[PDB]
Design a protein around this nucleic acid. Structure first.
Ligand SMILES: Nc1ncnc2c1ncn2[C@H]1C[C@H](O)[C@@H](COP(=O)(O)OP(=O)(O)OP(=O)(O)O)O1
Ligand SMILES: Nc1ncnc2c1ncn2[C@H]1C[C@H](O)[C@@H](COP(=O)(O)OP(=O)(O)OP(=O)(O)O)O1
Ligand SMILES: [Mg+2]
Ligand SMILES: [Mg+2]
Ligand SMILES: [Zn+2]
Ligand SMILES: [Zn+2]
Lengths: 348, 356
DNA sequence: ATCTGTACATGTACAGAT
DNA sequence: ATCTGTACATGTACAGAT
DNA sequence: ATCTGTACATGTACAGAT
DNA sequence: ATCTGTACATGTACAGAT
């Protein structure tokens, strides 16, 4: 009854979805046109929508949209940066860019920013660039505030990089056929736009599997009929929404939680879904246990400082390198706290 | 245990699989290549392997292969033949290498199949590598059948097909009722795939005899047989084994053995058993109603279901609901009651026909 | 010199074999 | 329980053509 | 090569029935 | 309270035409 009532609150309204979509769609379609019918280095860029709005796990409002502009590049040689798993250098139109991530992002951003100056019917500007974000972010204003991330991506049609050989461990959940077919899809690369000063900073790209993640979110049962009109509904997505909301609310309240992001929750629940594959373990009537064993799984990840990338097993999103220890026990007490008092933060 | 051992007899041997595939593939590759040559009307034809050997339900010996030579035919218009659901006239809206088979707008099936057949015959003459002849044409069959004598005997049905990429013909709207078993996304995807038309090729002196085509969904049946569980891991190396294909194999064998002894059964064919089990799989969607430890019971309910279809004279095509393969129009009641008796007799007496 | 239908190259599920 | 031939889907190369 | 048209998935919203 | 059935809305895949 409690968690159900929070999910009613988190539910997007049909009207809000329509108003945001037609304005987001107007901007994106025009932006896509410039990079094409104009003689840019990005002629051939194709649009692939990603993230929580398109996975139907957006909460609260339709105010954040993520779009990948992906560009096929033939026979690129990858070269893994210092064994990290997820970061690579790229080698062999694009001549003006070893292919520089920053050099290519800047021209892309230049093109976007120019075309936004020519938009006269929508209140839209280009947010100032952020370190560590490969996106060019639009800030739109219907009366309400909407944010669009335009992510630049390379598309390689080759065998996936060796670092993912043990990745995507869906074999007992979605199976070997699904896994083999998914690994036949392209894979993508996006700028590592960190501004730390470390060595190969400006030429490093990151592996992206947002297209695989979207398929999983929408094909998430061991039974083919899970959540379909002739199957049984499960509560896998509601748990992800609840865990996203609890992290959102904690991040509003505490600046110490700044190094956490919803992707950490997304990754943790891919692992849960793999360890509890049966749809009956995500039955709607057990929403509380499910949310709770998700909380405990997430605290075990904090306590051991271990949360491996679902596709890149050796890449630990929870290493000392990315999140100082103390940041983690801060989140652990805060989370054990909400847990052991019936989630007060959910009433605000 | 009794049925486990039948399956052991029925299992194909890798050695045989090997010697038979090496030959069969040689011939088919050579026939396909000749269809791309010169000013061939069939240039562009593409190969699709179908049937029980590629579904992995071929029993006893790998001695019968089925292959589809399908030709994409755009800008195509269908006239259902007399409300039968399965049979169609094919018309074109433009005036094409197929023109030599047109009869003002209407695409002649027997003319096309005849030209196809003459080419296979001519290319088989040039094969001096293996003992292989073209079997005398069989009425009702769209196939061109090769008999290969690699010591052992081997049949290959080369089926000629039109490939259309449009949405499926409305007589299938209510077909393929897999929503509760493989689900709606699977169904939507399957129905985006092409559909196929093969020559009906009967010689019954009925109107439009030589211009009637028949819907075929062999490619969809291939997908279903190799993706047959409600659970995605069914029969996979990290999932649980089921006995769905093992029931099919036992049913096919019972029919095969009886058909081998009793001429009364000429009207029957493995497609009848294959259809019945598609319905049984829809009736019982859960993989747990096909546990391997339940083989004798699973096989038994499939037999009961088949007897009911026989007795009530109703076995609806899985894809075309209004097309009844057990109508009086296609099989005498005496044919059906005869098979009913033999099935009931096998069932209530230890399946003595398995030991033959 | 560049283009492209044909076919080799690669990876793996399925299932027989040891 | 692992090793292994066939089938099949998709990436890529290049002799022969433009 | 680009774009429209079609089909049905995923949602939200709400009355009527359990 | 929840389940079921209809209406309403967007997202996405791809056939066919221009
Ligand atoms: N593949 C990734 N690797 C690292 N960080 C990521 C990745 N994907 C997303 N993030 C981070 C970026 C942002 O800080 C945060 C949310 O970004 P976003 O792309 O909008 O995700 P999302 O759409 O799945 O969830 P949300 O509901 O928060 O919008 O997650
Ligand atoms: N769609 C169909 N409609 C009518 N009869 C069919 C159909 N498909 C096959 N048949 C008939 C043709 C043969 O007489 C019999 C088996 O044909 P075939 O294509 O070899 O089937 P199969 O490969 O699935 O089974 P088998 O193991 O007996 O070869 O069924
Ligand atoms: Mg989002
Ligand atoms: Mg066969
Ligand atoms: Zn579900
Ligand atoms: Zn199975």
């Amino acid at each position: 009854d409690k968690l159900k009532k929070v999910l009613d609150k988190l539910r997007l309204k049909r009207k809000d979805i329509s108003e945001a979509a037609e304005t987001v769609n107007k901007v994106v379609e025009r932006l896509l046109r410039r990079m094409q019918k104009r003689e840019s280095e990005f002629k051939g860029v194709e649009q692939l929508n990603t993230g929580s709005y398109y996975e139907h796990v957006k909460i609260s409002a339709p105010n954040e949209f993520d779009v990948m502009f992906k560009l096929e590049v033939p026979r690129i040689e990858l070269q893994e940066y210092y064994e990290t798993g997820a970061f690579y250098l790229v080698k062999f139109p694009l001549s003006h860019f070893v292919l520089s991530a920053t050099k290519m992002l800047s021209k892309f951003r230049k093109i976007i920013k120019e075309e936004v100056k020519e938009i006269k019917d929508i209140d839209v500007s280009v947010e100032k660039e952020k370190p560590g974000s490969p996106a060019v972010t639009l800030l739109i204003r219907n009366p309400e505030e909407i944010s669009v991330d335009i992510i630049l991506a390379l598309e390689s049609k080759g065998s996936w990089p060796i670092s993912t050989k043990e990745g995507l461990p869906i074999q007992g959940w979605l199976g070997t056929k699904v896994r083999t077919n998914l690994r036949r899809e392209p894979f993508y690369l996006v700028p590592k736009n960190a501004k730390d000063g470390n060595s190969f900073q400006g030429e490093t790209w990151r592996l992206s599997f947002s297209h695989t993640e979207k398929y999983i979110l929408n094909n998430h049962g061991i039974e083919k009929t899970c959540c379909e009109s002739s199957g049984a509904k499960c509560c896998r997505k509601e748990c992800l929404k609840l865990m996203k909301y609890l992290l959102e609310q904690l991040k509003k309240e505490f600046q110490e939680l700044d190094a956490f992001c919803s992707y950490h929750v997304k990754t943790a629940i891919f692992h849960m879904w793999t360890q509890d594959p049966q749809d009956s373990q995500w039955d709607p009537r057990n929403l509380s246990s499910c949310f709770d064993k998700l909380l405990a799984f997430f605290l075990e990840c904090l306590r051991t400082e271990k949360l491996d990338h679902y596709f890149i097993p050796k890449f630990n999103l929870f290493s000392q390198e990315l999140i100082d220890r103390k940041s983690k026990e801060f989140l652990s007490k805060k989370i054990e706290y909400e847990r052991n008092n019936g989630f007060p933060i959910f009433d605000k």
